[PDB]
Design a protein around this ligand. Structure first.
Ligand SMILES: C[S@](=O)CC[C@H](N)C(=O)O
Ligand SMILES: C[S@](=O)CC[C@H](N)C(=O)O
Lengths: 153, 153
């Protein structure tokens, strides 16, 4: 029950190695969601939403089925895009309503992905506990999106 | 050693219902790999590969990271496209070579996905035991593919 630490150092190394020479977005996203899922303890969902036709639409991910459409400025994902900055949410509950979405997502973090400064999607990770993600997770997770951005650039 | 029965009757209802009113391929493929994963015991990988520029390129899936490219006519997946027919392998080992790919994959099932007479990809499922998929599994799984093909149609 004790969150066993994640060696982000190795993670960024495993990530870069993993998508080297690949430029196809979906493949990269798919393998990355799996990679993150294999090296992040105490979480229940890790994936990507893509910005298409002025909204977020579900991309590759590891976990149970999820909502396909997320309007901009709505939710943690929609908020990361409307403000184009990472969203680290310690308590997903007091964030917007407390409806049927109060499953195993107590805390959460969303990192926007950019290509030539424009938002092309976001990285979304859920956790069954509160305060799962902090400044440190933020830094490192943003380094990962950067490794991803390099292959899509 | 045993395989817990899978309620394909229900699964097909949740499937059709899960992707009702959706037409975005990646969203559908992603949520579908999740559904399959939550409803199939004794398997270690479930996902899709997309037919692009004369080859299969990794798509949404649930499991550990997988190889990105698979040329047509190659492996279990490439053969399903080159022959455009479902491929069921009772013992993946005796198939092709027994290299570093003999991991948790003992048996496998691949089902080509068609759109207006052409193949757009394949559903692929690995199992940690041999003979995981019998004629019954295949038919209902092909049924699942049909539900997906209806949405991509
Ligand atoms: C975007 S909304 O604020 C949360 C989405 C959810 N974490 C998911 O797994 O899709
Ligand atoms: C052609 S190959 O042997 C297909 C892909 C492999 N089952 C996988 O699980 O990714």
């Amino acid at each position: 029950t004790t969150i066993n630490p994640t060696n982000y150092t190795l993670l960024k190394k495993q990530a870069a190695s993993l998508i080297e020479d690949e430029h196809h977005m979906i493949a990269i996203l798919s393998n990355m969601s799996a990679l993150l899922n294999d090296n992040l303890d105490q979480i229940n969902w890790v994936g990507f939403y893509l910005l298409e036709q002025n909204e977020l639409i579900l991309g590759p991910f590891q976990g149970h089925p999820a909502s396909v459409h997320i309007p901009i400025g709505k939710g943690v994902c929609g908020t990361a895009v409307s403000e184009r900055r990472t969203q680290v949410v310690a308590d997903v509950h007091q964030f917007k309503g407390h409806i049927a979405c109060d499953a195993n997502s107590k805390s959460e973090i969303v990192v926007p992905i950019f290509k030539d400064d424009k938002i092309i999607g976001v990285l979304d990770i859920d956790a069954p506990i509160t305060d799962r993600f902090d400044d440190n997770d933020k830094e490192h997770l943003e380094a990962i999106v950067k490794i991803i951005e390099k292959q899509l650039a």
